[PDB]
Amino acid sequence: ACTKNAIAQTGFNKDKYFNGDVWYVTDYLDLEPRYCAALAAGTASGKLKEALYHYDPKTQDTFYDVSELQVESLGKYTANFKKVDKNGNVKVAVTAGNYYTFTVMYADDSSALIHTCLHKGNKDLGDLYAVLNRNKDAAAGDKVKSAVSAATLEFSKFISTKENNCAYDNDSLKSLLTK
Contact residues toward ligand HEM (CB under 6 A) are 25, 28, 35, 37, 39, 52, 54, 63, 65, 81, 83, 92, 100, 102, 116, 118, 120, 123, 130, 161
Tell me the residue number closest to ligand HEM, measured at CB.
83
CA distance 102 to 11: 16
**Residue (161 or 172) nearer to ligand HEM, CB:** 161
Q: How far is the CB of 172 from ligand HEM (least distance, A)?
A: 15
Q: How far is the CB of 83 from ligand HEM (least distance, A)?
A: 4
**Residue (83 or 179) nearer to ligand HEM, CB:** 83
Q: How far is the CB of 10 from ligand HEM (least distance, A)?
A: 21
**Residues ≥6 apart with Cβ < 8 Å to 157:** 29
**Residue (11 or 121) nearer to ligand HEM, CB:** 121
Is 54 assigned to a binding site?
A: yes
**Residue (74 or 118) nearer to ligand HEM, CB:** 118
Q: How far is the CB of 144 from ligand HEM (least distance, A)?
A: 14
CB < 8 Å & 24+ apart, contacts of 87-94? 87/172, 88/175, 88/176, 88/178, 88/179
3-state helix, strand, coil in the chain (%, to 5): 15, 45, 45
Would strands 99-107 and 47-55 be described as parallel, antiparallel, or unpaired?
A: unpaired
Q: Count other C-beta atoms under 10 Å from residue 94's C-beta.
A: 14
**Residue (61 or 171) nearer to ligand HEM, CB:** 61
Q: How far is the CB of 54 from ligand HEM (least distance, A)?
A: 5
For residue 49, what is the enclosing H or E element? strand 47-55
Distances (CA, A) of 173 to 10, 30, 33, 46, 63: 28, 24, 27, 18, 11
Binding residues for heme: 54
Binding residues: 54
